[PDB]
């Protein structure tokens, strides 16, 4: 007896049927009312076709490209009788162009990433700045400025980016309550930003530890991951990137800012998946994470910015990813960066291939009076198998966030282009929480200066343990 | 059947009965003639005691310390009737002090590391220079100058240091043939150095890839290795260290030299096991190694130094370790450095736990006319189990080098303090080769600049691919 949240009165066009599409389709079928023949999946892969045929769903074996996307998607999204929903879970497609097409035709839209057309991430004529998620996000912000309001389109609503924006709001509320600060929670963006400022939040890690492991050892010259290998390598080869807090007093020599845009970001002239940061999760305790670029690194810092009358930022948290992937992915990164090139083969771990483990994913708020607070999900593979098919624990955190964004978009269908920071976080977490396993908040007295300095000289700032100077591995 | 090289008539005193002692004792029993009652094993651990008793060998459950080593060891070393052999395969004991005791009492000596007394590797008042293997080795060189000749003591005769010195000589021979350099095979240190210089060898990696893996996955908060965890962690937390070649044109800002000594070394003010270098082996192809300090990095560069009349070095190869350990040790390093402290538990993989894999261990000579040449052993666990008990492939490469060193010392018992570079490499390899599996030379066109510059600006030296500037990972 699962809740059916809404009737969808139009076509459901799912672009992409890899690990996330495969975990999202059963949730869509479970939680929305629609005639089954309204749903069609689009993916160029033979593997995806065979799985879709086995699930009995309509399947169009085609790559969506700049040359064909209008021809293909417009008729599919406007088949009627009412408003359709474009669920974009693909690689190599332009989120912006597909979102703008959906909106022009009155269809709802959701995705989990601001993705460019094939050919972008490895174009040699591009500067590192132009390869940054800040630059991609700015194309979406400009599209919203050019066409405000209109049909709801939800950008970057997966686990991270996505759910972690809701966790930040919940964590801020909890931090205030744990101090005895009572009174209504924020309702506006400015109020959220000021809550973070008033609590003294210096920054936020998206602090993740994947402990899922397979029944076979990592094969030589095979990249192994629990979600998209292509997508992980793409973002891992983008510049390291972070939302940049007002409290930071140091940045590396190879860090750069941006001439234009929301003002919240810096990037480093080095690949994020080969950049390490010191961080912490409840199961990992102190660990290395990789400083992989993510939309929410910028979007959360932007959302939580307090400006003065003249428009300059007076407060902004640091925000970035601190990702410890599954052990086989750690080894895959060591192998890829060590060989200088991508492995000849790759595979994504299926739930049938996973022996145990969890995907621990939350937000680590630091610098406040209780030093650091981690809030998020500790979903295990064992629980995943019991509550949702066709995915591992990493996949279910993502697919259930897409579900929640879809509920929100159907309930708020005239909201325009929105990010996860713009949604009603309580409504979204109400939809998502049945799929998140243990959701817990944990304080720690760990800081990045724990145990330091050691037996070698280090450049550290002992007056401010959470300075990026102390977090970055150098 | 197996050759019995010599009769040993005196006591055989084995200090330490861990992974290497366990592998070396059966080879000693196989290849030397002696009454088993003349063996004596000294180790503080109960695990060692149970193993020794199972072998029916005399056992003393003591830790050898600065306070007790003269009182404990002299009666054992001088028990007669003949000359004794002290086989030191321990941790936390002073190689130098035990070696000098053995020589003072007419006993032969062999070890696989210049180890200091307990307390040194983590004394907070030691400057980084004093923690280097260069400095430890200089204490051995000083002892030789103080007491030339005398009873043979073989310093650092394992797989690496040890065997790889013999691989360097064989590789120089092979390169000379292949490049058409004419001349007699060297027979003195000065002739070997001149051969390296005439061949244009800019440098040498001790290039190693361990692919052994266990039937169980890496446990959380357990350091896993194929040999000493204590020993590996100790050397991994010493400064990164290398023999410094005359061709190098750049050193990092945190590199330092030495005021005194043989002059062949630099060290970096960072731990070697968290320092990566670009390297290459036949099985791994291009890979990261860790720049872990090792005696042979100095000893080989020193041995192959050519000087002019003024005693100034005019040629010297760069030489250093480029270690890719087994996958579980790679994960163990990521865990240890990421948490800032040693794991609470550790284990050494036993042959009964290893499912497959090899220990590929060789020397990569580079900068000559055929770019780079790797020469070494590709010993598999399957072959190891066929030919020797109680050890894995890593251990067998070490124990068989100790065996070769012992045979050499018996045939040359009044040669004074010697390193592996000073032994007759052909006799040593004649004893060792039955235990090395495939031993092969391979050329490659790979260089550290393959694929570079990439998508981000890099500080590289395009005039000479093999510069340390291009090898070191920043
Ligand atoms: N939390 C998050 O926000 C989050 C998490 C995971 C993944 N993602 C993103 O979601 C997307 C999918 O992840 P995944 O794990 O399912 O990836 P995946 O690699 O498993 O699958 C991607 C699918 O896209 C298909 N595809 C490729 N080119 C296409 C085209 N032109 N048109 C249509 N389909 C095409 C592929 O055939 C493949 O099946 C990725 O972009 C990834 O970066 C976001
Ligand atoms: N190729 C090489 O040159 C090479 C390779 C492997 C190991 N090694 C060195 O050989 C040594 C042994 O390696 P391992 O793998 O056998 O190590 P291990 O950790 O397995 O064993 C070390 C043994 O020494 C014993 N020990 C500790 N303190 C002692 C003391 N005070 N007196 C006597 N014994 C003591 C321990 O109880 C243990 O059994 C280490 O020093 C290691 O660095 C060299
Ligand atoms: N989320 C922000 N950064 N700003 C608020 C944008 C609100 C869009 N309706
Ligand atoms: N190996 C050296 N570096 N020098 C040679 C010294 C000879 C010792 N009997």
Residue numbers in the entry:
A (entry chain B), B (entry chain A): 3 to 476
Provide the authors' own sentences about this structure as they appear in the paper.
Bacterial HSS is mostly found in α-proteobacteria and in some β- and γ-proteobacteria, including pathogenic strains such as Legionella pneumophila, Brucella spp. and various P. aeruginosa strains, including PA7 and PA14. It catalyzes the conversion of two molecules of putrescine (PUT; 1,4-diaminobutane) into one molecule of sym-homospermidine [HSP; bis(4-aminobutyl)amine] as the main reaction along with several side reactions. Bacterial HSS is NAD+-dependent, active at neutral to basic pH with an optimum at pH ∼8.8, and shows increased activity in the presence of 50 mM potassium ion. BvHSS forms a dimer, with each subunit containing a boot-shaped substrate-binding pocket between an NAD(P)-binding Rossmann-like domain and an HSS-like domain. The cofactor NAD+ is bound as a prosthetic group in the binding pocket with its nicotinamide ring being part of the active site.
